[model samples]
Target: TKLGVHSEAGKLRKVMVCSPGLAHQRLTPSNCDELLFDDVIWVNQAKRDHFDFVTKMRERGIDVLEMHNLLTETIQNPEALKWILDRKITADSVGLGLTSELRSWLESLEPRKLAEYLIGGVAADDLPASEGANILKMYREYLGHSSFLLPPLPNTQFTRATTCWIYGGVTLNPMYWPARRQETLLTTAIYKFHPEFANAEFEIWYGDPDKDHGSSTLEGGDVMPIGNGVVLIGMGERSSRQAIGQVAQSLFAKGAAERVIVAGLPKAMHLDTVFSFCDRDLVTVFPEVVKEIVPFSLRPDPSSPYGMNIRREEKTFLEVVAESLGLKKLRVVETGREQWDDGNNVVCLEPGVVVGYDRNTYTNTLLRKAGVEVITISASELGRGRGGGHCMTCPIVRDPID
Candidate 1:
């Protein structure tokens, strides 16, 4: 199937996920935050839960693509290997002050081993004696004896932040955090070189993040395609208005989308954290943050193909959604206290079927009460990082709403 997504509630067919891997092995109490995690994740537990997520999805007939395996496959190509290695070494050189020996060592490893080292990180002691001694001196102050030549991308497991599937193409996001920027490289490599995705009909809606970093900042967690040629974006923490505008103009100009709805989610990091679709007309929302949320729409200009006409409107959350979808009224299941635990961030397997964290029992109960099927999974270790099922999975193909 071609890569695309039209609606959040469509029957999910294929998805992308980064099951907790070597990156989790490098997390420590002192450095987890710098890597964009609130706390250190129990790697073993996270692995178990992530495995369950993939297993359940497979049992339900959803194709599960793991990011780690994809990246490894991508680097097997000599060109792909060199491309990623050069960029990675160059980037690490500036921060970690990589020496010639360390650089040569990394370059010497085979593609697969290099990919593992890049993700799991190379220990200072693993380098040549001279390189290790110097690196220890450079990093010993803060990183101490437990120093690494490269920092592990602990957040790589959250595959949703890297790229988002929209319509018949994929938008490779300019990630918000610098630490998470390299995560995008995996998807870019897969699309450009992997056997399964290389020849796929997936268009690159947005370019590489490294090209333009100043004003354009977009994340998958903030962009939600709710069908009817409309997409909702949350602008605040992880996504900026400039990036939203960039995406809106691209969509309108290509005629891939008709309306780009913008809303401010200051308190929440991403829109999915406070709002998500459970069905065609059903959404779980955080009442406190969504109240009086002003909605704005961007539509293509008939006179100028690339130009957009902005329409501002003041409306309640429900009103905005109802008007956007052309529904008389929409049912909302409040996230309430469950908001802190990402109760609103459930991933819809289908229109009424969702996979949610078992910890959010109250919210799950509310969803069940509303005639929705909620499949619970253990996320104790995963939730500490502050992402739910939705943030953990990126849908590649979903059945079109009939």
Candidate 2:
């Protein structure tokens, strides 16, 4: 997994690490499933490799926040603990249930243990059967027999899905599934209570906090920052039309952005499979196969089936959206331009700065044309898990140079 840090100037600093709980191979999730991994990872060696990479980043001036450290700090605060308990109660409706037990325990345990339980999951023993296995159990029962206490936010590592400062407002991301809902909970806690950010503008979709947004979902991996006031959104099995529309409507109505473009990727899609963008005017995309550009609107007029008053053009979706917003150019990264599985996994630190596995020669060349600087990292192990830079890193902050 790659840990990404971005500065206000749109520069990306990075440290690569193995995911948490790597030692427990069986616990690994499948890529297509909610847990996000199909096979177990060789975590022992993965940690060593990550430690070496992070040490290198530290040697430079890059400050890397390990997931373990951040979780530790979050669990240590009273406000954080209170917020977590409150969310548990809200997520599950057990009258006098795990909420009491959680608070009682949180108030006692040290930060390290607290963080571990929070991320790893609260076991059946954690809350006991006094109120039906725990708050998570009650929540599962409340949600009609779900399989989680709070349902682990396995995707929390991709922080960009939560929210980030863009221009003068915040774009609150809708999550891909209800199982990962805790991600928003934890993300809100970190940003609201963390010392690093106490005054950030909050951006989020409505159902996110209320858990009633609709059946649609979104993930950070599907969202990409191509440049100034320009972004590429992938709509597919994971990201629903309703979720996309919700964000677009919110942004447009709030004037949070001048333009929003929607591109529909396939159902079994990873943005890396067909699309990628680099600095300058380069965008790596698969033609016809997966990069079929479709214009979508969150606020599609109810009177008409099409939704938006304007029919979004199918061709040149990225460039058209950018131009409408007065953006000068649209970079193209054609992944299937030559090879299958070109290096499509990338993290965009800024408009033009990106990094990914250095396997795709054509895609890299395409990125160069767009004025993007590229860094190649070894994603061999991560690739086996079917995720890359964008999938692993969760960015918390970034706003235009006002």
Candidate 3:
């Protein structure tokens, strides 16, 4: 069984799904959010493929769980469901008037159906006079729905960005992009309200309901657990230095982690694009000039749009990370270092076994040197969008060996 912040119980269990987004006819690719659509995947086929994947897991005698399954379990708790429903309705700008009425309305639905409604969202479901006039129209416009709501979570495929299971607790990252924000809902409820959980306290880096220090934007995809009281974080693209500092402070302050190594990456918007820890002792990184020449980009403070040219670099993000966490060696994953592929797209299933895209020749060589076995799978069909294994799996549970 699992025990600790990252552990689900005494045993590590559960994984989040990354499904292709289902959009409405009116909302074409041009108008849709960039972070949302990766490619046009047949939802039914994707679902079938994912189902087969789970079957393979079962064949391997490993337990597999889905985002919706865990969510439905959490919503079984009436109190928790009400809390989430209230939050969603209020957050739905158009549902402001209907927000107050949501709880009473939600309370009336069965657990199973209510869970579906909240996630899949509502249609013309019978409305009160006040809602009939304002709420309905607002919802339609807000969703860009001519008829029904498209509650498809497009970025769900990048599960790593949304959820993290570490040190006996789950750390849920709020999606910076609006279309994917609801993923926080799935993760938050899993730990807070799931029966499989012992009411584990998840690290919510971001606050709820427009409240924060104005310097908090960390994503799980930017983080990599490096064992021995150490973690490596990337501060680029999706995450910022301010966010890294805030996360470091929180982790150190809570004693949740001894050291949080901060690194910055280029190539893509965030760290996971170039680096990830494959096992207890191994790390795979994208070989960028930053590590050899500079550590981070020197930029003006967020408060100052145009200020002094304050220069800053950490010898590439990895150098700063390795130094801060006191890590001995940093494994480098080169795109086509052997074959062209995203560097560091591997995920650690245990202490020594990991799964990654097989064709990444250079990174695999490094993994073997680190004494880690690497399993490869072609995410090419999904890789065109620039994400691979690390992007697909959302770890909701992992056993931490101190």
lDDT of 1 at 398: 77
**Per-residue CA lDDT of candidate 2, range 20-112, in tens?**
452233253442254654455565665554455455445544556666566678767777777776776542543445556655665678887
N/CA/C clash count, model 3: 22
How does each model score on lDDT? 0.79, 0.54, 0.55
By descending TM-score, how would the candidates be arranged? 1, 2, 3
Residue 196 shift from truth in candidate 1, angstroms: 2.0
Q: Could you arrange the candidates by lDDT from highest to lowest?
A: 1, 3, 2
For residues 1-402, could you state the per-residue lDDT of candidate 3 as single tens digits?
453324211122456664442322123465435436655545555555455544544454456666666666778887777667656665354244455555566668776666655554444443444534355566557976433322444555566776665554455564566556676665666666777664454555433433332445567777755444555566766666766665555555555666555554544466666556665334565455335433432222435434212345536565555554455755544442343545566655666666666566666767777777766665544454567766777665555554
- For each candidate in turn, the TM-score is 0.92, 0.73, 0.73
Clashes of each: 0, 30, 22
Q: What is the Cα-based TM-score of model 2?
A: 0.73
lDDT score, candidate 3: 0.55
Q: Which residue segments of model 2 deviate by more than 4 Å?
A: 1-9, 13-19, 22-36, 49-63, 89-103, 124-153, 162-168, 201-207, 270-273, 288-291, 296-309, 318-333, 336-340, 350-353, 358-373, 398-402
